[PDB]
Each structure stands twice: as structure tokens, then as C-alpha cells.
């Protein structure tokens, strides 16, 4: 057996995706950088058997297309799967789109042509994505002209998706109705693409509602419309492609390959001809609102989740250190701190950033440096615990504030109760529950909260 950490060292965390964390890693010999998705066997159940997973992996490694993330290697130990792929640095498509001041049907067609081209290739090799959405579209690099790379093609077949809301935010909008009912094939990827296109040209989901379940009720019915004012600025051709992608009965829905030949793709991807090409201003602003809402809901859930974890780990670490403290004096040396923190990791296993003993020792050392000023030999286990854990939550509280500021586009310092309803609907926190909480934070509020109040609401909503 090949051992992942014998070949790769973790450099830093890139982000969190479907099925687990993605870590930027480096080959210890060749210096090659790679993005490694680390799938925790305890958090993510397998749908297929080992034999079937190894065959898919072997096939995925041999496929190459400019719009599909490249998979290089695959490893498995006792606790995890490690999927080693190429690293891309351009970020999510929609986060790039919202930074633009101009965006036209030509831009949307360039985008969707890449996606269809990647999908067409994968379907020829009988691989289905199933969970296609804007988050799965990454830009190769931060350059303006960057290609799209679809991530996670094929994983849904072998791993069961999380039922935690923090993991399924913005999933409901894109799922094909046949996937909900159980009989699906590769045409589900065209539907998801169709939803994405609708969003690109209007900035609003064709199937929408106040919570995950209302969205699904709309998807399952299959009915949508083009009556938004900003569709008047959109070519008839584009709407026609959309109708064909969003056709309810999958045998009647256009194939990926045929969608590539559609008049709209043929017309608006000719690099020269701007026969009539206005900028879709309302769309871009709707997308910016959509995206800020999604990101703030997501950051709010991860904030709560991080706060629940830190309650768990603080108490567990303290009990581990307490038992290691044979003196009873409350002190421990470095190796013991390392030993208990590893004992924590052995139990916790939510920390893919700590891929080997080398990772642990350095985290401990960051904290021993952090104990303000240093006496070597006898360390107050109590303070190390506070600092180790504050460290763990940083990314998530800091991210929460950032996302609040980004959602507050007029810099008003506040979010309205109408806005709270939209955020909490997307986060799937019941309506009665969040108002009761507000009422307790600020008994006099007048339909808006500042950042501190919102944060206090989140703490109450996770039992603090």
C-alpha cells in the first residue's frame, strides 16, 4: 500500500467542499503542488463497494479535458480517502462574475459552452456529476480569460452526500426533478446546467422559495417562467436553449452534446460578431445579491458549527490533560501537550489539516510561541487549551464578519428583518425560532440588527 503522507506534505487549507476538506499539498520530492480532497470515512458513507470505487478512480485518472479537474492520485487508509488533483487558483465562477462591471450574453455563452464541453466529454465516458452547481465551477487562474474546471465529477456515485444544512446550502436550486424521485441518468447534468444558465442571464433561480423544502416543491413541479423584466433584454435563442435544458421528462431534454450545437451557443461564442450585445446590468446585481446571501447563510452555519465543535474539543482536551497531569499541579511539558493533542485528533478526526505528526507538532509550537512569553519545561495546560481553540475558530468568526460586511453592500452597518428572513430561510432556521432569539438579544429592536446583535443571535441558536 502507498501512504499519502509519505509522498505529500500539507501546506495550507484551501477550503471545504462536498465530502470534505481540500488541502493544498506538496510532493516531498518533486515539489509538485496539488489540491487534495480528504474524505473522512466516518462522516461520509460509501454507496458502492471498494472494487467499484477503485475502477472509477482508475478511469478518472486517464481522462483529460480542459474543463474537467484533473485527478492525479488516489489513496486510502484506515480513516480516509485522499483524492489528489490539480490545484486551481481563480476561485468560484460566481465570485469572479460579481467583481465585473459588464456581463453580456457573449460572456454567458462562453461560460456555458465550457461547461457543456466538459459535461459532453464526461457523459461519453459514462460519468455523471449529479450535483452540478456554481460552486463546482472553478476558474483555472485569476486571469480574466481563465478556463472553467468542473470539480467533483463522479464522486456522487460513490459517496453519500451530507444531510447537514451547512453542507447542502444552495443544493436545492440545481438538482433535477428525476434525482429527487430516484430514477436518473446523465440528463440530470443538462438540467443543472440549464438552471445555471437561467441564473447567468437573469440573476435569479428559476425555482425559488423561502426554505429548502419550498424550493424542492417548485423543482418537483417543474414550472418556471421568463416574466422577470430583465428577460426582455435576452435573446429568444437563449430562452430556447433554456427550455430545452429545463425539459421535465429526461428522454425529451436536450443532450449536452446537442446543446453545444444549439443556435445560441453557435451565435454568441463567435469571438468577433457583436450583432447586438448589451450588458445585463440587472442580472449582475441580482447575482451579487444572490451570492452575498448564500455566502452569509453558509458562514452563519459554519460559525455555529465551529462554536459547537469548540465546546466539544475544549472539554475533551481539558479532560485529556487533566488525566495526563499526574502531579495535579496543572502543568505539562511539550511532549505531553503534543501527546494529548494527538490523542484528541485520534478521537476528533475533523482535522484534515493535521495530516501527520509533523502537522501537530507545528500547531502545538504555534501555540507555545503564542503563550505570550516562554518558560520551557512546565506549561499551564489551561491556557494552551484556550489559545489552541481560539485558533481553530478564527477562520470561521473572521469569515462571519467578512460575509456580513459583504452582504451589507450599502455599508449601512445593519441588516433588516426582511433580510434576516431571507438569510435564515436559506440557512433553514425556523422563523419562530430566530425571532424569539432576537427578542432576547435586544428587547427594543426596530427591525434591524448590527453585526454584534446578529452574532449574538447565532450564539443563542447554537445553545449558547
Ligand X SMILES: CC(C)(C)n1nc(-c2ccc3ccccc3n2)c(C(N)=O)c1N
Report 316-335 residues binding ligand X (CB under 6 A).
none
Please list the alpha-helical segments (H only) found in 145-228. Answer: 165-168, 177-181, 188-202, 212-221
131 is catalytic: yes
User: Which range of residues in 15-23, 288-296, 361-369, 405-413 is near ligand X by CB under 6 A?
Assistant: 15-23
Give the burial string for 279-288 (b: 16+ CB within 10 Å, else e): ebebbbebbb
Give the burial string for 4-36 (b: 16+ CB within 10 Å, else e): bbebbebeeebebbbbbbbbbbbeeeeeeebbb
Report which DSSP code applies to 141: S
Annotated ligand binding at 258? The verdict is no
> Would you give the end-to-end CA distance of the chain in angstroms?
46
Annotated ligand binding at 96? The verdict is no
User: Which range of residues in 79-87, 196-204, 292-300, 319-327 is near ligand X by CB under 6 A?
Assistant: 79-87
Annotated ligand binding at 410? The verdict is yes
The crossing angle, in degrees rounded to 10, of helices 236-245 and 105-124 is 30
Nearer to ligand X, 54 or 249 (CB): 54
Q: How many CA atoms lie within 13 A of 189 on its CB side?
A: 28
User: In the bound complex, what is the minimum distance in angstroms from residue 18's beta carbon to ligand X?
Assistant: 8
Candidate residues 2, 3, 11, 15; the one interacting with ligand X per rule CB under 6 A:
15
Annotated ligand binding at 126? The verdict is no
Nearer to ligand X, 85 or 425 (CB): 85
Report 212-271 residues binding ligand X (CB under 6 A).
none
Annotated ligand binding at 414? The verdict is yes
**DSSP per-residue letters across 255-275:** PHHHHHTSHHHHHHT-SS--S
Q: Is residue 426 close enough to count as binding ligand X by CB under 6 A?
A: no
For the record, the C-alpha cell of 304 comes out as 455555529
Q: Is residue 88 close enough to count as binding ligand X by CB under 6 A?
A: yes
User: Which range of residues in 84-92, 102-110, 360-368, 384-392 is near ligand X by CB under 6 A?
Assistant: 84-92
Nearer to ligand X, 152 or 212 (CB): 152
CA dihedral of residues 346, 352, 355, 357 (deg, nearest 10): -40
Candidate residues 10, 20, 85, 203; the one interacting with ligand X per rule CB under 6 A:
85
User: In the bound complex, what is the minimum distance in angstroms from residue 379's beta carbon to ligand X?
Assistant: 34
User: In the bound complex, what is the minimum distance in angstroms from residue 84's beta carbon to ligand X?
Assistant: 6
Residues in contact with ligand X, total (CB under 6 A)?
A: 14
Answer yes or no: are the C-beta atoms of 157 and 201 closer than 8 Å.
Answer: no
Candidate residues 20, 25, 35, 407; the one interacting with ligand X per rule CB under 6 A:
35
For 327-420, strand residue ranges (E) read 331-332, 379-380, 414-416
User: In the bound complex, what is the minimum distance in angstroms from residue 194's beta carbon to ligand X?
Assistant: 23
Annotated ligand binding at 329? The verdict is yes
Give the burial string for 166-195 (b: 16+ CB within 10 Å, else e): bbbbbbbbbbbbbbeeeebebbbbbbbbbb
The C-alpha atoms of residue 9 and residue 31 are separated, in whole angstroms, by 10
Q: Is residue 22 close enough to count as binding ligand X by CB under 6 A?
A: yes
Report 136-195 residues binding ligand X (CB under 6 A).
138, 151-152
Nearer to ligand X, 399 or 460 (CB): 399
User: Which range of residues in 85-93, 140-148, 246-254, 363-371 is near ligand X by CB under 6 A?
Assistant: 85-93
User: Which range of residues in 14-22, 214-222, 275-283, 453-461 is near ligand X by CB under 6 A?
Assistant: 14-22
The C-alpha atoms of residue 364 and residue 372 are separated, in whole angstroms, by 14
Annotated ligand binding at 214? The verdict is no
Annotated ligand binding at 208? The verdict is no
User: Which range of residues in 81-89, 97-105, 156-164, 394-402 is near ligand X by CB under 6 A?
Assistant: 81-89
The crossing angle, in degrees rounded to 10, of helices 451-460 and 381-407 is 120
Report which DSSP code applies to 187: T
Annotated ligand binding at 331? The verdict is yes
Nearer to ligand X, 87 or 423 (CB): 87
Candidate residues 25, 44, 83, 388; the one interacting with ligand X per rule CB under 6 A:
83
Catalytic-labelled residue, pool 6, 95, 107, 131: 131
Report which DSSP code applies to 16: E
Annotated ligand binding at 442? The verdict is yes
Candidate residues 17, 209, 222, 305; the one interacting with ligand X per rule CB under 6 A:
17
> Nearest to residue 379, comparing CAs of 439, 329, 448?
329
Three-state secondary-structure class, residue 76: strand
Q: Is residue 122 close enough to count as binding ligand X by CB under 6 A?
A: no
Candidate residues 38, 44, 60, 69; the one interacting with ligand X per rule CB under 6 A:
69
Residue in this structure with the C-alpha cell 443563542, named with its chain if needed: 460
Q: Find the radius of gyration of the CA atoms of the chain.
A: 24
> Nearest to residue 250, comparing CAs of 192, 201, 196, 168?
192
Summarize as ranges the residues that interact with ligand X (CB under 6 A): 14-15, 17, 22, 35, 37, 69, 83, 85, 87-88, 138, 151-152
Please give the positions annotated as active site: 131
Annotated binding site for ATP: 37
Amino acid at each position: 500500500t502507498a501512504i499519502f503522507s509519505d509522498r505529500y506534505k500539507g501546506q495550507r487549507v484551501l477550503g471545504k467542499g462536498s465530502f470534505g476538506e481540500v488541502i493544498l499539498c506538496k510532493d516531498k520530492i518533486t515539489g509538485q503542488e496539488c489540491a487534495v480532497k480528504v474524505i473522512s470515512k466516518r462522516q461520509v458513507k460509501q454507496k458502492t463497494d471498494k472494487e467499484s470505487l477503485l475502477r472509477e478512480v482508475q478511469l478518472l485518472k486517464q481522462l483529460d479535458h480542459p474543463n474537467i479537474m484533473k485527478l492525479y492520485e488516489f489513496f486510502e487508509d484506515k480513516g480516509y480517502f485522499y483524492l489528489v488533483g490539480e490545484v486551481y487558483t481563480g476561485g468560484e465562477l460566481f465570485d469572479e462574475i460579481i467583481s465585473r462591471k459588464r456581463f453580456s450574453e457573449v460572456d454567458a455563452a462562453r461560460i456555458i459552452r465550457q461547461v457543456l464541453s466538459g459535461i459532453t466529454y464526461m457523459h461519453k465516458n459514462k460519468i455523471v456529476h449529479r450535483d452540478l452547481k456554481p460552486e463546482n465551477l472553478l476558474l483555472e487562474s485569476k486571469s480574466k480569460d481563465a478556463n472553467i474546471r468542473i470539480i467533483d465529477f463522479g464522486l456522487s456515485t460513490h459517496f453519500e452526500a451530507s444531510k447537514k444544512m451547512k453542507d447542502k446550502i444552495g443544493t436545492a436550486y440545481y438538482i433535477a426533478p428525476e434525482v429527487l424521485h430516484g430514477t436518473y441518468d446523465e440528463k440530470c447534468d443538462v438540467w443543472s446546467t440549464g438552471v445555471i444558465l437561467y441564473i447567468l442571464l437573469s440573476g435569479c433561480p428559476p425555482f425559488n422559495g423561502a426554505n429548502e423544502y419550498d424550493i424542492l416543491k417548485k423543482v418537483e413541479k417543474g414550472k418556471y417562467t421568463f416574466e422577470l423584466p430583465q428577460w426582455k433584454k435576452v435573446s429568444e435563442s437563449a430562452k430556447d436553449l433554456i427550455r430545452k435544458m429545463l425539459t421535465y421528462v429526461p428522454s425529451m431534454r436536450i443532450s449536452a452534446r446537442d446543446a453545444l450545437d444549439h443556435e445560441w451557443i453557435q451565435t454568441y461564442t463567435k469571438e468577433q460578431i457583436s450583432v447586438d450585445v448589451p450588458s445585463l446590468d440587472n442580472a449582475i446585481l441580482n447575482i451579487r445579491q444572490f451570492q452575498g446571501t448564500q455566502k452569509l447563510a453558509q458562514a452563519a452555519l459554519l460559525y455555529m458549527g465551529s462554536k459547537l465543535t469548540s465546546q466539544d474539543e475544549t472539554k475533551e482536551l481539558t479532560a485529556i490533560f487533566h488525566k495526563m497531569d499526574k502531579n495535579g499541579d496543572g502543568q505539562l511539558d511539550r511532549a505531553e501537550l503534543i501527546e494529548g493533542y494527538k490523542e484528541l485528533m485520534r478521537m476528533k478526526g475533523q482535522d484534515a489539516s493535521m495530516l501527520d505528526a509533523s502537522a501537530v507538532e507545528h500547531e502545538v509550537d504555534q501555540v507555545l510561541d503564542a503563550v505570550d512569553f516562554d518558560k520551557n519545561g512546565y506549561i499551564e495546560y489551561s491556557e494552551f487549551v484556550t489559545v489552541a481553540m481560539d485558533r481553530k475558530t478564527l477562520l470561521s468568526r473572521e469569515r462571519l464578519e467578512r460575509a456580513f460586511r459583504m452582504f451589507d453592500s450599502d455599508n449601512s452597518g445593519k441588516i433588516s428583518s426582511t433580510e434576516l428572513a431571507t438569510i435564515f430561510g436559506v440557512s433553514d432556521v425556523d422563523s419562530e425560532t430566530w425571532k424569539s432569539v432576537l427578542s432576547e438579544v435586544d428587547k427594543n429592536n426596530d427591525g434591524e440588527v448590527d453585526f454584534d446583535e446578529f452574532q449574538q443571535m447565532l450564539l443563542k441558536l447554537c445553545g449558547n
